[PDB]
Enzyme design. Structure first.
Site, PDB file in Angstrom:
ATOM      1  N   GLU A  33       0.846  -1.180   0.000  1.00 45.20           N
ATOM      2  CA  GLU A  33       0.000   0.000   0.000  1.00 45.20           C
ATOM      3  C   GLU A  33       0.885   1.235   0.000  1.00 45.20           C
ATOM      4  O   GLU A  33       1.902   1.279   0.697  1.00 45.20           O
ATOM      5  CB  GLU A  33      -0.940  -0.006   1.217  1.00 45.20           C
ATOM      6  CG  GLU A  33      -2.128   0.947   1.142  1.00 45.20           C
ATOM      7  CD  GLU A  33      -1.745   2.402   1.329  1.00 45.20           C
ATOM      8  OE1 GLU A  33      -0.973   2.703   2.264  1.00 45.20           O
ATOM      9  OE2 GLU A  33      -2.232   3.247   0.551  1.00 45.20           O
ATOM     10  N   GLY A  34       0.504   2.231  -0.799  1.00 45.71           N
ATOM     11  CA  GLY A  34       1.216   3.490  -0.857  1.00 45.71           C
ATOM     12  C   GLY A  34       0.242   4.623  -1.107  1.00 45.71           C
ATOM     13  O   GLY A  34      -0.911   4.402  -1.474  1.00 45.71           O
ATOM     14  N   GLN A  35       0.741   5.843  -0.915  1.00 45.56           N
ATOM     15  CA  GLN A  35      -0.062   7.061  -0.947  1.00 45.56           C
ATOM     16  C   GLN A  35      -1.124   7.061  -2.038  1.00 45.56           C
ATOM     17  O   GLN A  35      -2.281   7.409  -1.783  1.00 45.56           O
ATOM     18  CB  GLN A  35       0.850   8.274  -1.126  1.00 45.56           C
ATOM     19  CG  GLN A  35       0.122   9.544  -1.488  1.00 45.56           C
ATOM     20  CD  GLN A  35       1.061  10.717  -1.592  1.00 45.56           C
ATOM     21  OE1 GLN A  35       2.257  10.590  -1.327  1.00 45.56           O
ATOM     22  NE2 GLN A  35       0.534  11.871  -1.982  1.00 45.56           N
ATOM     23  N   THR A  81      -2.653   0.734  -4.265  1.00 46.07           N
ATOM     24  CA  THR A  81      -2.453  -0.532  -3.583  1.00 46.07           C
ATOM     25  C   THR A  81      -2.101  -1.601  -4.609  1.00 46.07           C
ATOM     26  O   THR A  81      -2.696  -1.661  -5.685  1.00 46.07           O
ATOM     27  CB  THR A  81      -3.702  -0.919  -2.773  1.00 46.07           C
ATOM     28  OG1 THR A  81      -3.476  -2.149  -2.076  1.00 46.07           O
ATOM     29  CG2 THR A  81      -4.931  -1.030  -3.654  1.00 46.07           C
ATOM     30  N   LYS A  97      -1.562  -2.612  -9.741  1.00 41.79           N
ATOM     31  CA  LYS A  97      -1.541  -1.394  -8.952  1.00 41.79           C
ATOM     32  C   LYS A  97      -2.882  -0.713  -9.168  1.00 41.79           C
ATOM     33  O   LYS A  97      -3.111  -0.105 -10.216  1.00 41.79           O
ATOM     34  CB  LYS A  97      -0.381  -0.494  -9.365  1.00 41.79           C
ATOM     35  CG  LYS A  97      -0.199   0.700  -8.464  1.00 41.79           C
ATOM     36  CD  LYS A  97       0.933   1.597  -8.915  1.00 41.79           C
ATOM     37  CE  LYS A  97       2.269   0.946  -8.655  1.00 41.79           C
ATOM     38  NZ  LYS A  97       3.409   1.860  -8.916  1.00 41.79           N
ATOM     39  N   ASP A 119      13.114   9.397  -9.207  1.00 46.19           N
ATOM     40  CA  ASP A 119      12.746   8.824  -7.922  1.00 46.19           C
ATOM     41  C   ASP A 119      13.571   7.577  -7.640  1.00 46.19           C
ATOM     42  O   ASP A 119      13.065   6.607  -7.074  1.00 46.19           O
ATOM     43  CB  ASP A 119      11.254   8.501  -7.880  1.00 46.19           C
ATOM     44  CG  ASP A 119      10.739   8.313  -6.469  1.00 46.19           C
ATOM     45  OD1 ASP A 119      11.245   8.993  -5.549  1.00 46.19           O
ATOM     46  OD2 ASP A 119       9.826   7.485  -6.280  1.00 46.19           O
TER      47      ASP A 119
HETATM   48  C1  I74 Z   1       3.647  -2.336  -9.238  1.00 49.99           C
HETATM   49  C2  I74 Z   1       4.882  -3.084  -9.720  1.00 49.99           C
HETATM   50  C3  I74 Z   1       5.987  -2.164 -10.180  1.00 49.99           C
HETATM   51  C4  I74 Z   1       5.304  -4.236  -8.814  1.00 49.99           C
HETATM   52  C5  I74 Z   1       5.665  -5.502  -9.239  1.00 49.99           C
HETATM   53  N1  I74 Z   1       5.953  -6.268  -8.207  1.00 49.99           N
HETATM   54  N2  I74 Z   1       5.774  -5.497  -7.066  1.00 49.99           N
HETATM   55  C6  I74 Z   1       5.941  -5.880  -5.789  1.00 49.99           C
HETATM   56  N3  I74 Z   1       6.362  -7.235  -5.489  1.00 49.99           N
HETATM   57  C7  I74 Z   1       6.551  -7.697  -4.127  1.00 49.99           C
HETATM   58  C8  I74 Z   1       7.769  -7.044  -3.462  1.00 49.99           C
HETATM   59  C9  I74 Z   1       7.954  -7.228  -2.109  1.00 49.99           C
HETATM   60  C10 I74 Z   1       9.035  -6.653  -1.471  1.00 49.99           C
HETATM   61  C11 I74 Z   1       9.936  -5.888  -2.185  1.00 49.99           C
HETATM   62  C12 I74 Z   1       9.754  -5.702  -3.539  1.00 49.99           C
HETATM   63  C13 I74 Z   1       8.679  -6.285  -4.179  1.00 49.99           C
HETATM   64  C14 I74 Z   1       5.707  -4.947  -4.803  1.00 49.99           C
HETATM   65  C15 I74 Z   1       5.319  -3.672  -5.191  1.00 49.99           C
HETATM   66  N4  I74 Z   1       5.069  -2.672  -4.185  1.00 49.99           N
HETATM   67  C16 I74 Z   1       4.722  -1.318  -4.585  1.00 49.99           C
HETATM   68  C17 I74 Z   1       5.927  -0.359  -4.655  1.00 49.99           C
HETATM   69  C18 I74 Z   1       6.526  -0.159  -3.303  1.00 49.99           C
HETATM   70  C19 I74 Z   1       7.840   0.622  -3.334  1.00 49.99           C
HETATM   71  N5  I74 Z   1       8.789   0.086  -4.341  1.00 49.99           N
HETATM   72  C20 I74 Z   1       8.210   0.032  -5.704  1.00 49.99           C
HETATM   73  C21 I74 Z   1       6.912  -0.775  -5.709  1.00 49.99           C
HETATM   74  O1  I74 Z   1       6.327  -0.701  -6.979  1.00 49.99           O
HETATM   75  N6  I74 Z   1       5.170  -3.358  -6.461  1.00 49.99           N
HETATM   76  C22 I74 Z   1       5.395  -4.291  -7.400  1.00 49.99           C
END
Ligand code: I74
Lengths: 65, 281, 297
Positions: C11-13, C16, C32, C123
């Site tokens: 979850e972010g600003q 989700t 997302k 970023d």
């Molecule tokens: C939306 C897209 C770019 C995406 C693809 N896989 N994934 C995962 N995967 C799980 C995860 C867990 C822990 C660390 C990294 C990824 C987590 C995640 N979280 C949202 C943000 C949070 C901050 N970093 C960039 C992410 O897109 N976004 C994504």
């Protein structure tokens, strides 16, 4: 299994764009606005603007759908 | 960058008859949907009537972006006009009114080109009662996702303005036969505006459009520029490419010449028919 | 709407993120879904949609799909198992120089592609560097990415997470270029070498103090026009710590890469292309293949 840099060939269907560091010594920068000291302090140089304009002018000039 | 853009890959078409077929298909689909919803009824609009109304509402979009406060950058106006063209390329004027789609295209163009305008400012640019401005804002927000879906989520639009500036830089630096190419600018600008009233933006690359505008200004000025194309642009080494480019520019100029503005009385009749069709939508 | 929601990824600003299956091909994707008045679709979602539809590189996150309902839109990306922050913070993982080389190589290739198309990621940080199951780093989180190279457009200076923000942004640069990304790469590289945030300033002035304390207060010979920046305040003349004292295990080629990435002059600061050309990446050892990169499990 050592890395070697490859120039990342992407087809611009148009004429050759002169290189970013070539622009001044080829006289292009005479015809764009000079970057202000703030822009230079930030890293904007008017070689960026000139280069982007030249790239857009040539991007797909030879391309047909 | 245009040469690998979604605009090149999906929204640049082989000929004006493919555009005609797409628009005829959209008109036919709305007719078939309405008949299946409850066939040769004069209430519908024929595709050329839809084209006339699209041209009229494109002009109104230009006017709206002309008087827009704060001043709208030209890239935003081009993006909005491209959105209008693409939407009504695959959609019927009888299903989605071009006035609301006009405003929705302007709104999405402002957001996409990072022209930070608050919604109150945007709808304050509408010469309407404030209640009508709130109603128009509600309709704009209602249609926004619909526009994005009908654009296939391809929101970046490559306009001929930046390639125009690049060609002017290149002429100043590499083509000294032409003294002060800026004398072209205004006239080239005019021709560029005319190209925007046609379907060229869906048929040619923005660099081809910009080069056509510049060369047309030069020919209108009595200036020959085959030497710029052949030697400066190195088309002396590839004559097939020079022929292709000259054909592209010739066909763009013809497509500008055979352009016909929407006639005011014709547009009034077609607008009344459009209101009749949307009242009984 | 062909997507079966498996898990909750975060979850972010603005949104989700959920793990999902694309039923039409049975793929694992990340949805997302954008959260939310009278302003329409979120501009961060539109920014990411518009920029990621124009980019196609192995080391940039692929926007596989997009859809939604009234004013709520959702973006379908490649599913990534981890981000570089998880590798950096996993004390069980040993970051060999080859692993650091691989991560820096993929980051700089993605950034070279991104900068060649006149987009600043803007970023960059270890969270935004995601790793798929095959060990392929991808740049992600394009919600702040912006096209650069246009004089007519002014950019904000509060745009990179403070710890990875270049000094021209902390000094308030409104016009900038690839330096703001490359500095962050340096910071990421530094963190890869230290496993700790390199320049963890508590505030903007504290961030500038950390930078100048670690690397020396820049002179006008190092950074001409530095005083022209809107938020320039003169600092103490810190000698700065030599890089081989900071990065004790760094070879001279890696130190040259680090020094290039951390030049105060944003014009003299190396770009991704010339960072990729430096002998650090050409030297031995070769970067590790993705299949052999360390996996925090
Ligand atoms: C939306 C897209 C770019 C995406 C693809 N896989 N994934 C995962 N995967 C799980 C995860 C867990 C822990 C660390 C990294 C990824 C987590 C995640 N979280 C949202 C943000 C949070 C901050 N970093 C960039 C992410 O897109 N976004 C994504």
């Amino acid at each position: 299994a050592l890395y070697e840099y490859q120039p990342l060939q992407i087809e611009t269907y148009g004429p050759h764009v002169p290189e970013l560091e070539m622009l001044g010594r080829l006289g292009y920068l005479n015809h764009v606005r000079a970057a202000s000291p703030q822009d230079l302090a930030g890293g904007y140089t008017s070689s960026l603007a000139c280069h982007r304009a030249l790239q857009d002018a040539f991007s797909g000039l030879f391309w047909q759908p | 960058m245009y040469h690998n853009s979604s605009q090149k890959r999906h929204w640049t078409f082989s000929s004006e008859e493919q555009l005609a077929r797409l628009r005829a298909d959209a008109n036919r689909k709305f007719r078939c949907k309405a008949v299946a919803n409850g066939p040769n009824d004069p209430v519908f609009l024929e595709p050329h009537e839809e084209m006339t109304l699209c041209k009229y509402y494109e002009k109104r979009l230009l006017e709206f972006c002309s008087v827009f406060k704060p001043a709208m950058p030209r890239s935003v106006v081009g993006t909005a006009c491209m959105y209008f063209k693409r939407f009504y390329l695959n959609n019927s004027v009888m299903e989605y009114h071009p006035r609301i789609i006009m405003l929705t295209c302007a709104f999405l163009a402002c957001k996409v080109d990072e022209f930070n305008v608050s919604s109150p400012q945007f709808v304050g640019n509408l010469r309407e009662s404030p209640l009508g401005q709130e109603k128009a804002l509600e309709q704009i927000l209602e249609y926004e996702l619909l526009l994005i879906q009908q654009l296939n989520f391809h929101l970046i639009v490559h306009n001929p303005y930046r390639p125009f500036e690049g060609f002017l830089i290149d002429l100043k630096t590499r083509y000294p036969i032409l003294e002060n190419p800026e004398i072209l600018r205004k006239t080239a600008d005019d021709f560029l505006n005319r190209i925007a009233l046609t379907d060229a933006y869906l048929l040619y690359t923005p660099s081809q459009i910009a080069l056509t505008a510049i060369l047309s200004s030069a020919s209108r000025a009595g200036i020959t520029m085959e030497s710029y194309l052949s030697e400066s642009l190195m088309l002396k080494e590839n004559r097939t490419c020079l022929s292709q480019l000259l054909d592209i520019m010739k066909s763009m100029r013809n497509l500008v010449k055979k352009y016909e503005p929407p006639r005011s009385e014709e547009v009034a009749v077609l607008k009344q028919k459009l209101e009749r069709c949307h009242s009984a939508e | 709407k062909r997507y079966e929601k498996l898990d909750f990824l975060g979850e972010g600003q603005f949104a989700t993120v959920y793990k999902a299956r694309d039923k039409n091909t049975n793929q694992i994707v990340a949805i997302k879904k954008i959260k939310l008045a009278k302003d329409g679709i979120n501009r961060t979602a539109l920014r990411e949609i518009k920029l990621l539809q124009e980019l196609s590189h192995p080391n940039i996150i692929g926007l596989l799909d997009a859809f939604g309902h009234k004013s709520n839109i959702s973006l379908v990306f490649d599913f990534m198992e981890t981000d570089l922050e998880v590798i950096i913070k996993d004390n069980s993982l040993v970051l060999t120089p080859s692993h650091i080389k691989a991560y820096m190589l993929m980051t700089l290739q993605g950034l070279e592609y991104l900068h060649q198309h006149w987009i600043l990621h803007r970023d960059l940080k270890p969270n935004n560097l995601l790793l798929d199951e095959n060990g392929v780093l991808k740049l992600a989180d394009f919600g702040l990415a912006k096209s650069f190279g246009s004089p007519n457009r002014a950019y904000t200076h509060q745009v990179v997470t403070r710890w990875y923000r270049a000094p021209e942004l902390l000094f308030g640069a409104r016009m900038y270029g690839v330096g703001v990304d490359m500095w962050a790469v340096g910071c990421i590289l530094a963190e890869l070498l230290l496993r700790v945030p390199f320049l963890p300033g508590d505030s903007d002035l504290d961030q500038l103090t950390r930078i100048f304390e670690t690397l020396g207060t820049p002179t006008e010979e190092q950074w001409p026009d530095m005083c022209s920046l809107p938020d320039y305040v003169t600092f103490k003349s810190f000698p700065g710590i030599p890089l081989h004292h900071i990065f004790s295990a760094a070879g001279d080629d890696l130190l040259d890469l680090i020094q290039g990435l951390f030049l105060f002059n944003p014009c003299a600061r190396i770009t991704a292309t010339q960072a990729l050309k430096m002998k650090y990446f050409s030297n031995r050892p070769g970067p590790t293949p993705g299949c052999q990169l360390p996996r925090p499990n």
